Design a protein around this ligand. Structure first.
Ligand SMILES: *[B@@]1([O])O[C][C]([C][O])O1
Length: 261
């Protein structure tokens, strides 16, 4: 289609490898570009860790208010929020919000620990029918994004379907789902990515990701004003280990998708 031609041309212009999956919940149609290829998730994996804890809170009604101690040893490479609470505590809700809205790596590692390790995050994926998602490492090493390395990867198709279920479907309880949507809508790191390719009137909840090999990711739920919502996943990675982030590519891919709806 016209859109796949333009996405292919965008990819060629960028020098990297682009993965796109759009789900139009209006008619359940899908637009895929390298939709079944594996990409490093980087911090887009934090959505799965947060959703897994949310699922736990369906039975442990007070779980999200459980305080968790932040020790100096817990601090890794990027902890904008956890930094503010060293030698203090953060609730599991505050850590979930920090992981999603500020991409705090210490917060993500606490969520993984709460779930019993990376295997616990991956287990949740399988429980909701995602057989592609795999989380193998903790922060920060899950961002190495080595070409061909299957660790800590998923496919755009798989992530789009799963994000739909978590935010628009009923993989989570009603209150948990709404909390996840609220967190995603208040993301602070996505202004230059998918959001930048879309009309300013559209409401967007997203989670960005970045890592080595210039890996630049964004996954988003989109609520156009007066229209069925959309799920859009954009994954991008490059052949040089030290390549710069290319959020402009994500914005351009979203703009190309928006043209047509
Ligand atoms: B994720 O990918 O988003 C930011 C941090 C950087 O290490 O991880």
């Amino acid at each position: 289609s016209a859109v796949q031609q333009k996405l292919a041309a965008l990819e060629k212009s960028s020098g990297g490898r682009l993965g796109v999956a759009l789900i139009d919940t209006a008619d359940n149609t899908q637009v895929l570009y390298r939709g079944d290829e594996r990409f490093p998730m980087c911090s887009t994996s934090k959505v799965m860790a947060a959703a897994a804890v949310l699922k736990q809170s369906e039975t442990q009604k007070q779980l999200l208010n459980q305080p968790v101690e932040i020790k100096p040893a817990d601090l890794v490479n990027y902890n904008p929020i956890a930094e503010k609470h060293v030698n203090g505590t953060m609730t599991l809700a505050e850590l979930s919000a920090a992981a999603l809205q500020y991409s705090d790596n210490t917060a993500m590692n606490k969520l993984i620990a709460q779930l019993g390790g990376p295997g616990g995050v991956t287990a949740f994926a399988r429980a909701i029918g995602d057989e592609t998602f795999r989380l193998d490492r903790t922060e920060p090493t899950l961002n190495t994004a080595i070409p061909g390395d299957p660790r800590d990867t998923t496919t755009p198709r798989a992530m789009a379907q799963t994000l739909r279920q978590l935010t628009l479907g009923h993989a989570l309880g009603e209150t948990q789902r709404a909390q996840l949507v609220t967190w995603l809508k208040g993301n602070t790191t996505g202004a230059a990515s998918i959001r930048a390719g879309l009309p300013t009137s559209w409401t967007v909840g997203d989670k960005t990701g970045s890592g080595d090999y210039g890996t630049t990711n964004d996954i988003a739920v989109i609520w156009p004003q007066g229209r069925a919502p959309l799920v859009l996943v954009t994954y991008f990675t490059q052949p040089q280990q030290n390549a710069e982030s290319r959020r402009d590519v994500l914005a351009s891919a979203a703009r190309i998708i928006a043209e047509g709806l």
